[PDB]
Amino acid sequence: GSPEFQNPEVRFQQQLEQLSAMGFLNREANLQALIATGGDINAAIERLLGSS
Numbered sequence: 848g849s850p851e852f853q854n855p856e857v858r859f860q861q862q863l864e865q866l867s868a869m870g871f872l873n874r875e876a877n878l879q880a881l882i883a884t885g886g887d888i889n890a891a892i893e894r895l896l897g898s899s
Contacts, residue, residue: 852882866891 850857857863858878865888866877873895880891880899 852878855879862886862888866895871895 852859855875855878858874859881862881863874863877866880867874869892871877871892876895876899877891880895881888884891884894
């Protein structure tokens, strides 16, 4: 219906599907990478693989 993207459960669901799609197992890390990237999952892929 209308959950809170904050919780790492949803993991930004779709957004997660993307960072996950690039071979990321750190789900919680995707949700957050997405929150800090405002949707720029690609920008998140490069940064996420970086360190955080």
